[PDB]
């Protein structure tokens, strides 16, 4: 039982990790994709420049 | 406690995030006042003087 | 046994998840300040060109 | 390692205030740059006129 319960809780460890890698990774992927526009937009500017 | 207290590393981040923000476009205003406070004030010795 | 395999194999998944975590946040802290630091020089580069 | 990561976001700490004298002075030099540029964006325009 203290077995279960504590091996139960690395499963309730494992899913609160996973919303949060799921919801950082999200996050991340984001502010990759507004890097890249604002880096191709930035280039354009810089060459014009 | 270290997630959480990486949860205030991330938050944080924002500040010193949102300090580049600001940072960087007031950085560039001295380079895109430059440019011109110089370019313009030799036109203008030329044109105006 | 199979407790204690599931909990010690759930403890190494909890190492991976927040191993993880660790790294997609160094990443996303990075990748936050780039796209913030390129999103408001963008907006900074424009006024330049 | 939970204080590592306290560390880290107390190392933060103190690059965000760093970054804040950094802000401060180019937020200082950014207002003082929208003059000069505003000026000689006018003194340019009456050169021509």
Redesign the interface.
């Given at each position: 039982q203290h077995?279960?319960a504590?091996?139960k809780k690395?499963?309730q460890?494992?899913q609160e990790?996973?919303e949060?890698?799921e919801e950082?990774?999200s996050?991340?992927q984001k502010?990759?994709l507004?890097?890249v526009t604002?880096?191709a937009?930035?280039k354009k500017?810089?060459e014009?420049? | 406690q270290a997630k959480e207290n990486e949860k205030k590393l991330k938050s944080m981040e924002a500040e010193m995030i949102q300090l580049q923000e600001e940072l960087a476009a007031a950085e560039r205003a001295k380079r895109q006042a430059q440019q011109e406070r110089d370019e313009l004030a030799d036109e203008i010795a030329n044109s105006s003087g």
């Open positions: 077995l279960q504590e091996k690395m499963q460890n494992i990790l996973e949060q890698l950082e990774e996050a991340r502010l990759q507004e890097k604002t880096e937009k930035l500017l810089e014009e420049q | -």
